[PDB]
Structure formats: C-alpha cells, structure tokens
Amino acid sequence: GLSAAQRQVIAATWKDIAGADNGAGVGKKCLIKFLSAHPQMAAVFGFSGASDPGVAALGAKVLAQIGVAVSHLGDEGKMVAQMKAVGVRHKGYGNKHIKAQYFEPLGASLLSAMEHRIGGKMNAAAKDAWAAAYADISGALISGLQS
Numbered sequence: 001g002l003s004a005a006q007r008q009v010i011a012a013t014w015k016d017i018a019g020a021d022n023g024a025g026v027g028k029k030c031l032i033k034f035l036s037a038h039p040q041m042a043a044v045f046g047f048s049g050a051s052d053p054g055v056a057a058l059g060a061k062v063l064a065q066i067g068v069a070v071s072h073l074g075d076e077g078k079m080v081a082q083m084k085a086v087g088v089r090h091k092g093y094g095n096k097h098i099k100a101q102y103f104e105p106l107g108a109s110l111l112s113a114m115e116h117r118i119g120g121k122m123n124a125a126a127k128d129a130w131a132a133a134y135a136d137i138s139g140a141l142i143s144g145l146q147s
C-alpha cells in the first residue's frame with residue numbers, strides 16, 4: 001500500500017510518463033534495455049534478442065497495464081486483485097519458468113526509462129514513490145503467478 005503522499009506523486013507523474021502514446025515509448029525502452037543488459041532474458045520471453053519487434057509490442061502492453069493499476073490506487077483492493085489476475089495469466093506465458101527474481105532488475109529498467117522520458121520530474125519523491133508502486137504492482141502479479 002502507498003501513503004496518500006506517494007499516491008499523489010505517482011498519479012501526477014503518470015500523466016507525463018503516459019505522454020502521447022500511452023507510455024509505449026517507455027515500455028519499448030524499458031524492455032529493449034533490459035534484454036540488452038541481461039541477454040539471458042530473451043529466451044524467457046521467447047524473443048530473438050533486444051531488436052525483436054515483439055519487444056516493442058510487449059513493452060506497450062506492460063505500460064498500458066501499469067496505467068490501469070495507477071487508475072485504481074484509490075482502491076488498493078481492486079489494484080491487487082487485478083494484478084493477481086494478470087499474474088495468473090503468466091502461468092502460461094514465456095518459454096522458461098518465470099521467476100520472482102526477474103522482476104527486480106525489470107523494475108530498475110522501468111524506473112530508468114521513466115526518468116529518460118520525464119527528466120527532472122523524476123525527483124527524489126517520485127523515485128521513492130515509483131519504487132514503492134512497482135513493488136506493490138510486481139508483488140501482486142508474482143502472488144498470482146505463484147498461486
């Protein structure tokens with residue numbers, strides 16, 4: 001759960017992160033860079049490498065889903081149930097076992113991609129709030145994945 005101050009920050013910066021492509025560019029950057037830094041992850045996703053066009057398609061889907069979770073930060077219960085459902089779906093995705101450990105490095109790539117787009121708006125308070133928001137969102141997915 002996020003405090004009211006954290007919720008305020010996430011909601012405000014999300015508008016700038018979504019920009020004019022519902023966050024698709026952020027999702028592309030996040031995954032491309034993730035796979036370039038951890039080559040081993042391509043096989044998990046079933047991608048040929050960082051330049052596989054499925055990287056951009058999937059990055060857009062992940063960011064759109066984060067937008068949905070943010071719209072429900074007012075009702076933690078809904079956010080978590082929704083993310084759990086996404087997590088259950090992951091039971092049938094990928095070519096390698098999807099492990100909880102993979103989520104941490106993905107989170108770093110995501111926060112970096114957000115910063116690359118909004119710059120200065122990703123201040124100390126935004127970095128703290130987004131790390132907590134990502135921990136709740138990824139935590140809920142993992143709970144469904146592991147159920």
Ligand code: HEM
Pocket residue numbers: 044045046058061062065066086089090093094095098102103106137138141
């Ligand atoms: C390292 C962690 C991750 C891995 C390995 C994983 C992998 C996958 C794969 C292989 C696909 C399916 C493409 C096709 O349908 O076969 C997918 C779909 C999806 N992923 Fe994940 N993903 C990860 C993290 C997450 C995160 C953190 C989110 C959201 C917060 C998420 C949201 C989605 C959604 C929305 C789609 C589209 C399909 C549907 O809605 O079920 N993914 N993921």
